[PDB]
Recover the amino acids of this structure.
């Protein structure tokens, strides 16, 4: 399976950006984003069960970001709003068959990610 | 040193398709980022499409996702950009560009650059 990522770049504090990630190559699986701020370890940001319904957000982004899916297109979307300097990071699309394993990162499929720079 | 050899592009009516290609020669890494930026009239260059040569991950600008597709021939250090459903405002100079690192690639500044290939879209 391959991951096709979109979006990112620079944005003014308080603004918005939209990411997307399409997976190509299971009927249901977990997909979403982790991020890595320079100097920090990578951390989960948001997940959705593609082909299911459940979502998860890191408390630091809940109510500012929205994750959604297009299951027919095996694609997820991350609407990032109210951006803060602390959100500057590489955002990585990542997938696993199972949401519990997805949370750990270690066994996931990983994209090369996209930079988001909040000024 | 590394040289980027560009081909493709040209002119088409809106709704049509064009392809670009770019081959790197010289010192290349085991994996590296290659793809295109473009410079539309009045604007500075902006990232369009990236692939991890020697890997599989791709990235697209939001404005081109789904219409454009980037692919590779890893062993030939070549990438390809298939542009479908082209719009007037896809008119631009398209530059092949390379960096060792995908996230540095996105900045442009530190990349190796091709000469650029014109794309024009007529109504």
């Amino acid at each position: 399976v391959k991951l096709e990522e979109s979006g990112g770049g620079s944005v003014q504090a308080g603004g918005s950006l939209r990411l997307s990630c399409a997976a190509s190559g299971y009927s249901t699986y977990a997909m979403g984003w982790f991020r890595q701020v320079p100097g920090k370890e990578r951390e989960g940001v948001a997940r959705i069960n593609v082909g299911g319904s459940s979502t998860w957000y890191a408390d630091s982004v809940r109510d500012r970001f929205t994750i959604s899916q297009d299951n027919a297109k095996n694609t997820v979307y991350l609407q990032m709003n109210s951006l803060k300097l602390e959100d500057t990071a590489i955002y990585y699309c990542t997938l696993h068959r199972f949401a519990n394993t997805w949370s750990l990162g270690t066994l996931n499929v990983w994209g090369q990610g996209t930079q988001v720079t909040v000024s």
About this structure: Residues 1-119 of chain A form one domain.
